[PDB]
Design a protein around this ligand. Structure first.
Ligand code: CL
Ligand code: CL
Length: 149
């Protein structure tokens, strides 16, 4: 079974509405808020915050520069969810397919962000994407603590 899944939910200090705003409509702000991790988010096709938009990421993992091109496969405004499909990039040297879902819970008094990965490894030997999940969690923490009082 080359297929895998990972799920991590974290509680956040900041407004879930703003977190989803960023992930849906203003993804480029992550370069500002997590500049060690994300160097560029560049829209290639479509419009920010729409299904089918195509986005290019310049990012760094363990000090090494990587790129990905993703398509926004799905949006659910009611559940504050967005689904990214990796279509090109460094990850495709390890994974045949890779999808990342970000979903924000803005009830009740606590807000949280859940990251879900669905992937298929090219080979049985390929590592599970723990390092990427740590990355996504770090980005989350960088957003929630950006320019705090
Ligand atoms: Cl950017
Ligand atoms: Cl749409």
């Amino acid at each position: 079974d080359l297929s895998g899944k990972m799920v991590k939910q974290v509680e956040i200090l900041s407004d879930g509405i703003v977190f989803y705003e960023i992930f849906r409509y203003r993804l480029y702000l992550i370069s500002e808020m997590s500049p060690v991790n994300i160097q560029g988010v560049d829209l290639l096709e479509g419009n920010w915050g729409t299904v089918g938009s195509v986005i290019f990421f310049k990012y760094t993992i363990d000090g090494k520069e990587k790129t990905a091109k993703d398509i926004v496969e799905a949006i659910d405004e009611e559940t504050k969810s967005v689904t990214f499909k990796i279509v090109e990039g460094d990850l495709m040297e390890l994974y045949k397919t890779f999808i990342i879902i970000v979903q924000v819970d803005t009830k009740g008094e606590h807000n949280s962000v859940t990251w879900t990965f669905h992937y298929e490894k090219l080979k049985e030997d390929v590592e599970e994407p723990n390092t990427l999940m740590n990355f996504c969690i770090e980005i989350t923490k960088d957003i929630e603590t950006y320019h705090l009082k």
